[PDB]
Design a protein around this ligand. Structure first.
Ligand SMILES: Cc1cc2nc3c(=O)[nH]c(=O)nc-3n(C[C@H](O)[C@H](O)[C@H](O)COP(=O)(O)OP(=O)(O)OC[C@H]3O[C@@H](n4cnc5c(N)ncnc54)[C@H](O)[C@@H]3O)c2cc1C
Length: 471
């Protein structure tokens, strides 16, 4: 492409980083990357479990059989008759290419798997090594932009502390600029004909929860304070359709910090902790009470009903075998005092359980006996407890509680990632796209673990590819 006005990408999470890289590297289309925060990555950089992909090289290497058809099956079942099926088809059918794109263009290994709740096979990818997936992916894609900027600063500029407040359109009805407030609070205009909203969800905003799902306003959240639904409100005022805004995902296992128990913000206890073998104990009786590997809305519903109405939490318990397959993450969690290594005798007393140590041993040995039917029908039991566990054996334990986590609703988009005008099938504007958590319809009533990072790559690349046909 010959250089014209920049494409403005709003948000430096995975959606924005994907859009930016695809635009610069494949077509030489110049980018200005705005973010209202003081650092890159949003909630993407916090991602812990990984990114989904169906029929990958990694699944081939590990001899798991998976297809775009099966992924779509699990996705449709999780959505519960909400959402937009061609978006669910597109997400699962492009998942192979998304994984391969990260592998070949950035040398991200993504060589390990985990099976999360509501998945029929393991398909959530992470790389071996010391870096969790959200940080490793964001670091790689953002470093490439800085490398490119360093050789040609007019090809990409990253402008942090820049809050978009509106899009200016001409008499009818095309993009001419993006209005933003700079670091000093001064109103600025970036002239452009193309904008991609990659600005994230709205889970942090109590004001918007009160409007779209008021029952959740007292819950704590995993979301960064920047997660305030800005893009959703801007595009709605400009005439865009919003969909599924009342579908808010409450994640069942946010960590309780024992020295900060009532912080509205929680570290997340990754769903990979359960898929890789973790179980949940009731915090008074000390017994298992639910299928830990169901979808997030179901686990949350089980905790909120079966655990105490006041003090609504649970103990996430993980074996040594879990630890050996998730070592660096659990070491991190322990560094924040969120997970403790404790003998079973001491487990009973520090958590004031009703079960005896010998009784808990008997339960754990039964749980780990794959030849006995699981009480709660758990579909995958791996990395369980040693057949000769005793009351002096050690386990890893944290306290967890449900948290507002992800907003399935957002602005209506199509398969080209273009924003849909209210009450229409026509795009709101030739030059307005959206990608990632800011958009609605991809997940319906519940998002499967691992699918939002995936959504960012799939629809970030798509917006970039379709802008190139219009630049
Ligand atoms: C702790 C945590 C762990 C997670 N782990 C996983 C996982 O393992 N697998 C998975 O699939 N999903 C995971 N998720 C969900 C997923 O990471 C997020 O949905 C993902 O970050 C969405 O990417 P995004 O690019 O749309 O938004 P974000 O990553 O949130 O980026 C949005 C950016 O837009 C910026 N912004 C907001 N408003 C403006 C504005 N007006 N102007 C300019 N910039 C603005 C924000 O500051 C932010 O940086 C996790 C989420 C959290 C909170």
């Amino acid at each position: 492409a010959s250089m014209k006005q920049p494409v403005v990408v709003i948000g430096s999470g995975l959606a924005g980083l994907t859009t930016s890289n695809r635009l610069i590297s494949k077509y030489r289309i110049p980018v200005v990357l705005l973010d209202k925060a003081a650092s890159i990555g949003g909630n993407s950089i916090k991602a812990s479990s990984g990114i989904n992909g169906a029929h990958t090289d990694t699944q081939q290497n590990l001899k798991v059989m998976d297809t775009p058809e099966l992924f779509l099956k699990d996705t449709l079942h999780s959505a519960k008759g909400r959402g937009v099926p061609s978006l669910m088809d597109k997400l699962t059918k492009e998942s192979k290419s998304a994984i391969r794109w990260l592998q070949t263009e950035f040398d991200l290994k993504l060589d390990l798997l985990a099976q999360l709740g509501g998945h029929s096979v393991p398909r959530t990818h992470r790389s071996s090594g010391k870096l969790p997936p959200g940080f490793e992916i964001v670091q790689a894609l953002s470093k490439k932009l800085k490398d490119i900027s360093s050789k040609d600063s007019n090809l990409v500029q990253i402008m942090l502390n820049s809050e978009v407040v509106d899009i200016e359109l001409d008499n009818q009805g095309h993009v001419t600029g993006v209005v933003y407030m700079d670091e000093n609070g001064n109103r600025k205009i970036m002239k452009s004909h193309h904008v991609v909203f990659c600005s994230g969800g709205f889970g942090y905003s109590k004001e918007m929860l009160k409007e779209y799902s008021p029952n959740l306003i007292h819950l704590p959240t995993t979301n960064g304070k920047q997660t305030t639904g800005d893009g959703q409100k801007i595009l709605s005022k400009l005439g865009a359709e919003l969909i599924d805004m009342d579908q808010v995902q409450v994640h069942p296992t946010g960590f309780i910090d024992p020295n900060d128990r009532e912080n509205n913000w929680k570290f997340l206890a990754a769903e990979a902790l359960r898929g890789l073998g973790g179980i949940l104990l009731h915090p008074t009786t000390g017994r298992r009470f639910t299928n830990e590997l169901s979808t997030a809305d179901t686990v949350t519903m089980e905790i909120q009903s079966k655990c105490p109405k006041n003090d609504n939490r649970a103990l996430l318990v993980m074996s040594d075998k879990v630890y050996e397959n998730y070592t660096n993450n659990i070491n991190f969690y322990m560094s924040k005092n969120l997970i403790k290594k404790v003998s079973i005798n001491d487990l009973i007393r520090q958590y004031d359980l009703q079960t005896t140590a010998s009784e808990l041993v008997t339960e754990l040995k039964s749980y780990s006996d794959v030849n006995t039917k699981d009480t709660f029908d758990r579909p995958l039991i791996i990395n369980a407890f040693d057949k000769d566990i005793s009351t002096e054996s050690t386990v890893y334990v944290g306290e967890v509680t449900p948290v507002v986590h992800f907003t399935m609703g957002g602005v209506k988009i199509n398969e080209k990632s273009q924003v849909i005008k209210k009450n229409s099938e026509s795009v709101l504007s030739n030059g307005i796209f959206a990608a990632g958590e800011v958009s609605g319809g991809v997940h319906g009533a519940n998002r499967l673990g691992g699918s939002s990072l995936l959504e960012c790559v799939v629809f970030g690349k798509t917006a970039a590819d379709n802008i190139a046909k219009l630049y």
